[PDB]
Design a protein around this ligand. Sequence first.
Ligand code: ZN
Ligand code: ZN
Ligand code: ZN
Ligand code: ZN
Ligand code: ZN
Lengths: 75, 76
Amino acid sequence: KRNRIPLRCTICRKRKVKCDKLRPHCQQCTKTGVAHLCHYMEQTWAEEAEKELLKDNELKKLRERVKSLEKTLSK
Amino acid sequence: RKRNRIPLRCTICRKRKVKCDKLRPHCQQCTKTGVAHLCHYMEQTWAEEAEKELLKDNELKKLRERVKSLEKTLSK
DNA sequence: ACGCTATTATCGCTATTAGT
DNA sequence: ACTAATAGCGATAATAGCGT
Ligand SMILES: [Zn+2]
Ligand SMILES: [Zn+2]
Ligand SMILES: [Zn+2]
Ligand SMILES: [Zn+2]
Ligand SMILES: [Zn+2]
């Protein structure tokens, strides 16, 4: 009774095919016209990793945004 | 109880309890399982990375709240 | 696009380093 | 010495991928 989460994107895991786990979307989906419906299930061991990947990306965006917002604010 | 050792196996490998070929920028274990954008090697102690992340956290909360406030102001 | 087999990854458990 | 902290193997559970 182990906990294994698919490493293939959920689309072409359903297709029971070979997933080139490319990110954000595997070539296999990109080719069958569904690039952006391609996503990978969350692993328990990539928790911290994934949460910091989000924190990182947000501080970055939030930073460049405060700038633009406050130049706008110049009425 | 004190931890002064900075691991040589990427963090994902530690988490996954496996062997890291310790290559850069990302170990091959991660590349094979497809989670390379998540591979990272500790450059600091756990307690140092923890504090560092805590402060990053606070900046996030204030920046988001500052962005929101500046967003509301913009009604007209 | 799917039954079936091949190949892989989870986690208890064994083993090694080092704090006190 | 005693044991937490750390590293990692390996049997086996469970997913990966083939060919159609
Ligand atoms: Zn795929
Ligand atoms: Zn997309
Ligand atoms: Zn896909
Ligand atoms: Zn690794
Ligand atoms: Zn790695």
